[PDB]
Amino acid sequence: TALVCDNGSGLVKAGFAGDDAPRAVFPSIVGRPRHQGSYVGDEAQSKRGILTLKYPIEHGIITNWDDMEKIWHHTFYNELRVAPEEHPTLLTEAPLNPKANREKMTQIMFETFNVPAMYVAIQAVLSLYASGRTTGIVLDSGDGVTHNVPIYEGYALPHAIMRLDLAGRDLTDYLMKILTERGYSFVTTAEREIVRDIKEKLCYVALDFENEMATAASSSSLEKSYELPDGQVITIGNERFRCPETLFQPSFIGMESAGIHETTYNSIMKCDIDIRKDLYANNVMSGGTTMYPGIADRMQKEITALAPSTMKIKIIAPPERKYSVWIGGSILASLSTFQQMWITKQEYDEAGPSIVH
């Protein structure tokens, strides 16, 4: 049985092909000490007070291979409890992953973990597959990175890919900051995980930011309360929608980038004029940070205002978005027609890292 490992900028989602959900999900964090002369995932977040935390995949691309090798080891042995030697392994990569990087992942899988076969697929493409499409444009917003990825007949169009270094983790930090400014304190681990939970539970995307501000200014109807496990009650109203509003207005956190509606449109306009109508009718959202209530409606509205007045625009937000990359891998790796697409260790031993391309 093949393995599916989605190497997330914030969370590893790993599991077995043909399953409907990952078995393991844990932070892609490696932690170490230092104040008076290595751990992974949860036990790195857990007792971290004696740890400096690092993201080896901070923005979707793997930048530290020793730490990544630790993550993968944790994944195989500690989370899935499998012998890597026994399972074909499908790995995910970010859009615009450099060739040497994909070569490096391939070598590690064969020469370190001795997998019998492997494959590397683009996350956004897997999400599109998961929704039953091979043409469309994906907005993938995860933990450390957001991409727009137009895909035609199963192929991501590299020159049209957009990247925004703003996603779930930044929205968490932003909510923390604005709550801190109001006088609340979050120093520990959960706090700050409590702030993450507040974000997930109470935040939403306004259909019209200014109108929602007016509503929050003139009534108490958007106020919501969250109880902290010591007695503190934090109440928030406009911060519920101001926080994810950052995705559409990155200036909220001092970033000069265009927002996710503008990058979606710019991505489409980089594509062959002949496929744009198919991209506009197939905007698929994926990733945890697209889970906000209202985000599809807002994207429908913003893309409509940017696109030609006639254009048919559809946003598809699958209920399972949060794991659709992983699920796309699960489907892909179980398909009969995929089984000769595996790179075998024999194919590898005969040609080296360059086979993946």
């Binding site: 039953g132 199963g154 699920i327």
Partner: peptide
């Protein structure tokens, strides 16, 4: 451009069949 039978399997896949 992905092979045709693969596209067909992807586009027509029935997400039941996925083990719980």
């Amino acid at each position: 451009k992905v092979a045709e039978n693969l596209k067909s399997q992807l586009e027509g896949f029935d997400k039941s069949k996925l083990k719980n």
